[PDB]
């Protein structure tokens, strides 16, 4: 049956960054686990923020502040820049 | 004195001024070798964590992979993939960085080597190389040769079931005597996976001093022997009636 994964997108990114480098099945699974873990943490933090502010929706602001609470300094900064850039590009297009 | 030439001169067996009766050996050759060793399966490369420069020699420079190198502290020499490359000071068995030696008569007991010049402590002198024997072959060759009425038995057990023979072919490190005051010692080094033995010093041997290490007492037959050094506690005879090996 269908067992969804981030395998393909991880491959795309990898080749974007290391075109000439493979990934093992075990490594691929680990990467998938990392992706899911970060997703869950950010989503939970955002939901918590939504609840704390008596708000019934999650917007990119909640995600952004969640990242700011979760990731470290430089990592958080670059992640925030990327997220805002992607949001702006999506809005424009 | 040594005068190693390929033409065999007039010399019966004394190995003095004409050591050209036997054939020399450069590396210990194996007989029953097989791909059942930890050579390239697990120990592929024990690279050292050095960060040399190599851009400063003869001025404020240091010898790479010194006593602070891990490999040297481990009784292991760096491989060809050392970060210095050819400036590594560990590959001494490959480059054959021996020391000055000479074989002459020094006592009626037998031929011996005396230091020619200064030789600081912890310095490679020579290497032990010879024919490595098998299990069933050792017990047969010893008994066949024991009846050959000979005094020198160049037998050295590298491991529990590997004895090296330097009788038929022996390098310069075969004339060394024994005494109760060892100024040298042997060390079991691992180069390229294979185990190798060497000969290092322990003190500031002056110029013109003997170079012998402490043998390990052991007997095989009923007969016994004794030494002739007489340093301070020259036991000579074996340590009791021993039979182990």
């Amino acid at each position: 049956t269908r067992k969804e994964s981030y395998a393909i997108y991880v491959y795309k990114v990898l080749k974007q960054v290391h075109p000439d480098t493979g990934i093992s099945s075990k490594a691929m699974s680990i990467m998938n686990s990392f992706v899911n873990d970060v997703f869950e943490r950010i989503a939970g933090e955002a939901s918590r923020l939504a609840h704390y502010n008596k708000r019934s929706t999650i917007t990119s602001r909640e995600i952004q502040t969640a990242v700011r609470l979760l990731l470290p300094g430089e990592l958080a900064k670059h992640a925030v820049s990327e997220g805002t850039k992607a949001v702006t590009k999506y809005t424009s297009a | 004195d040594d005068f190693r030439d390929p033409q065999r001169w007039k010399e019966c067996a004394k190995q003095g001024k004409m050591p050209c009766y036997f054939d020399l050996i450069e590396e210990n050759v194996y007989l029953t070798e097989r791909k059942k060793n930890k050579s390239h399966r697990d120990i592929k490369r024990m690279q050292c964590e050095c960060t040399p420069l190599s851009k400063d020699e003869r001025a404020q420079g240091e010898i790479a992979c010194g006593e602070d190198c891990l490999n040297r502290l481990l009784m292991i020499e760096c491989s060809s993939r050392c970060p210095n490359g050819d400036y590594c000071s560990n590959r001494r068995f490959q480059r054959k960085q021996h020391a000055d030696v000479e074989v002459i008569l020094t006592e009626k007991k037998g031929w011996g080597l005396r230091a020619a010049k200064d030789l600081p402590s912890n310095t490679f002198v020579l290497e032990y190389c010879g024919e490595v024997l098998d299990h069933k072959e050792f017990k047969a060759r010893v008994k066949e040769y024991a009846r050959n009425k000979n005094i020198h038995y160049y037998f050295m057990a590298l491991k529990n079931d590997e004895i090296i023979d330097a009788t038929q072919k022996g390098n310069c490190s075969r004339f060394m005597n024994h005494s109760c005051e060892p100024n040298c010692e042997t060390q079991k080094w691992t180069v390229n996976g294979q185990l190798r033995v060497g000969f290092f010093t322990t003190k500031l041997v002056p110029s013109g001093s003997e170079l012998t290490f402490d043998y390990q007492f052991q007997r095989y037959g009923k007969e016994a022997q004794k030494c002739f050094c007489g340093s301070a506690n020259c036991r000579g005879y074996l340590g009791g009636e021993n039979r182990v090996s």
Partner: protein, 78 residues
């Protein structure tokens, strides 16, 4: 400012912690650890405040900040 955490106060804290003999360099090391701890907690609390669009840091924000850090606090409307 930071030094306002007086050495004897650090001694009192340690005593409540069960310490009997205290070293000189302790005091400053404790000051540093306290500064770091406060930095993290207040950082998170501000972040919470900012997302709330408030110029006044609330207790609740402190509470969520501590809870994030796995240092849950009781007695301020948990």
């Amino acid at each position: 400012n930071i030094q306002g955490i007086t050495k004897p106060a650090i001694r009192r804290l340690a005593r409540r912690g069960g310490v009997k003999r205290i070293s000189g360099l302790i005091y400053e090391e404790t000051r540093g650890v306290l500064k770091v701890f406060l930095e993290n907690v207040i950082r998170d609390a501000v972040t919470y405040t900012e997302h709330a669009k408030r110029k006044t840091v609330t207790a609740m924000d402190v509470v969520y900040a501590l809870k994030r850090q796995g240092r849950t606090l009781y007695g301020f409307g948990g």
